[PDB]
Design a protein around this motif. Structure first.
Motif, short mmCIF file in Angstrom:
data_model
loop_
_atom_site.label_atom_id
_atom_site.label_comp_id
_atom_site.label_asym_id
_atom_site.label_seq_id
_atom_site.Cartn_x
_atom_site.Cartn_y
_atom_site.Cartn_z
N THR A 197 -2.39 1.31 -5.21
CA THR A 197 -1.06 1.44 -4.94
C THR A 197 -0.48 -0.28 -5.00
O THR A 197 -0.32 -1.02 -6.27
CB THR A 197 -0.30 1.97 -3.93
OG1 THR A 197 -0.92 1.71 -2.71
CG2 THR A 197 -0.34 3.40 -3.83
N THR A 198 -0.11 -0.75 -3.94
CA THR A 198 0.33 -2.31 -3.90
C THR A 198 -0.53 -2.86 -2.84
O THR A 198 -0.94 -2.41 -1.96
CB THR A 198 2.05 -2.37 -3.76
OG1 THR A 198 2.13 -1.53 -2.60
CG2 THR A 198 2.54 -1.83 -5.00
N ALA A 199 -0.36 -4.28 -2.78
CA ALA A 199 -0.82 -5.07 -1.75
C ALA A 199 0.35 -6.17 -1.20
O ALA A 199 1.05 -6.87 -1.90
CB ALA A 199 -2.02 -6.03 -2.08
N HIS A 200 0.69 -6.07 0.04
CA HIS A 200 1.66 -6.82 0.79
C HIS A 200 1.25 -6.97 2.21
O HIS A 200 0.53 -6.13 2.78
CB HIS A 200 3.07 -6.55 0.72
CG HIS A 200 3.37 -5.18 0.99
ND1 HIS A 200 3.18 -4.73 2.42
CD2 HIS A 200 3.53 -3.70 0.35
CE1 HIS A 200 3.31 -3.33 2.54
NE2 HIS A 200 3.45 -2.85 1.29
N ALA A 201 1.91 -7.84 2.85
CA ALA A 201 1.87 -7.74 4.37
C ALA A 201 2.75 -6.79 5.00
O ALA A 201 3.51 -6.42 4.47
CB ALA A 201 1.95 -9.06 5.02
N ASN A 207 -0.33 5.56 8.01
CA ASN A 207 -1.04 4.41 7.43
C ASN A 207 -0.30 3.08 8.27
O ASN A 207 -1.04 2.38 8.94
CB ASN A 207 -1.14 4.16 5.96
CG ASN A 207 -1.50 5.10 5.19
OD1 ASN A 207 -1.50 5.45 4.17
ND2 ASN A 207 -2.39 6.19 6.03
N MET A 208 0.72 2.81 7.68
CA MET A 208 1.11 1.20 8.17
C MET A 208 2.04 1.35 9.51
O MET A 208 2.26 0.24 10.13
CB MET A 208 2.54 1.19 7.04
CG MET A 208 1.79 0.70 5.84
SD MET A 208 2.98 0.33 4.42
CE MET A 208 3.45 2.10 3.95
N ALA A 209 2.54 2.57 10.26
CA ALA A 209 3.18 2.68 11.21
C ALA A 209 2.56 3.03 12.32
O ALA A 209 2.87 3.41 13.78
CB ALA A 209 4.58 3.33 11.23
N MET A 269 0.66 -1.29 0.06
CA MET A 269 0.12 0.11 -0.02
C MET A 269 0.78 1.38 -0.12
O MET A 269 0.17 2.36 0.01
CB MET A 269 -1.06 -0.11 1.25
CG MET A 269 -0.38 0.24 2.58
SD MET A 269 -1.71 0.03 3.86
CE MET A 269 -1.95 -1.69 3.87
N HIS A 270 2.08 1.18 -0.01
CA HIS A 270 3.02 2.20 -0.02
C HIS A 270 2.54 3.04 -1.12
O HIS A 270 2.55 2.96 -2.10
CB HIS A 270 4.60 1.76 -0.20
CG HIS A 270 5.32 1.15 0.89
ND1 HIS A 270 5.03 -0.21 1.32
CD2 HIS A 270 6.54 1.57 1.46
CE1 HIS A 270 5.90 -0.48 2.32
NE2 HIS A 270 6.81 0.60 2.37
N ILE A 271 2.68 4.65 -0.83
CA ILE A 271 2.62 5.43 -1.67
C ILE A 271 3.59 6.02 -2.46
O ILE A 271 4.28 6.59 -1.64
CB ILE A 271 1.38 6.71 -1.03
CG1 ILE A 271 0.08 5.99 -0.59
CG2 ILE A 271 1.30 7.59 -2.00
CD1 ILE A 271 -0.51 7.12 0.39
CO LIG Z 1 3.04 -0.64 0.61
#
Ligand SMILES: [Co+2]
Length: 214
Positions: free
Chosen positions: A64-68, A112-114, A1-3
């Protein structure tokens, strides 16, 4: 999901960064007060582990992307404030040394991620424990919910771009797809694949950690 760089307006980047600053500030104080040197290696390992699994993604048309991520895994084992710093460190290294996720988009991506991912994951995790579910199951469910909340946040940040930043002719200055595209696209990937992978990896590591062995 990294932009990546350029997906979000500089103004969006600035807001996200200004939101992420107080978080990391608070996180830093929380860790300083209750971590001792001996606990520092575990943060770094968690950080290197999240990095590694994040490198494995699949592009999402419309998103964007999909990953864990391993955000809830870090949150259940290090506490959410320390997961915050470990996860942010991973994102910093990805953007600065590998070009994965934009540099100005760092406030966005870490929010988002952190932040969202581990705090939602941990909150959900505590809830399932209070319903007397075991740690393996609660953490895995927390993982699923956490990564999906981060996907949603990402989808909403992107989707707002064409609505808020366009030419007088209505042409998108940055990310060109609206909420109608970005939300179903990002959420479908994360509800049906990335969330599960995240849940599985979370429960698995949590299981083996509790077993202290195998
Ligand atoms: Co990402």
């Amino acid at each position: 999901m990294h932009i990546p760089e350029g997906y979000l307006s500089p103004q969006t980047c600035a807001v996200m960064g200004a939101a992420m600053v107080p978080v990391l500030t608070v996180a830093a104080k929380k860790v300083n007060k209750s971590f001792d040197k001996k606990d520092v290696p575990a943060m770094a390992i968690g950080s290197a582990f999240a990095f590694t699994i994040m490198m494995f993604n699949v592009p999402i048309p419309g998103g964007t992307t999909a990953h864990a991520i391993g955000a809830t895994l870090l949150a259940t084992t290090l506490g959410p404030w320390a997961a915050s710093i470990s996860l942010t460190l991973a994102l910093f290294i990805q953007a600065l040394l590998f070009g994965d996720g934009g540099i100005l988009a760092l406030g966005a991506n870490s929010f988002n991620m952190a932040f969202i991912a581990p705090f939602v994951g941990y909150g959900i995790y505590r809830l399932m424990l209070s319903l007397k579910l075991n740690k393996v199951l609660s953490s895995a469910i927390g993982g699923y919910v956490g990564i999906n909340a981060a996907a949603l946040a990402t989808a909403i940040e992107l989707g707002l771009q064409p609505l808020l930043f366009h030419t007088a002719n209505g042409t998108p200055l940055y990310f060109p797809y609206g909420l109608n595209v970005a939300i179903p696209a990002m959420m479908f990937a994360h509800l049906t694949v990335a969330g599960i992978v995240e849940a599985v990896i979370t429960g698995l590591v949590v299981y083996y950690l509790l077993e202290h062995h195998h």
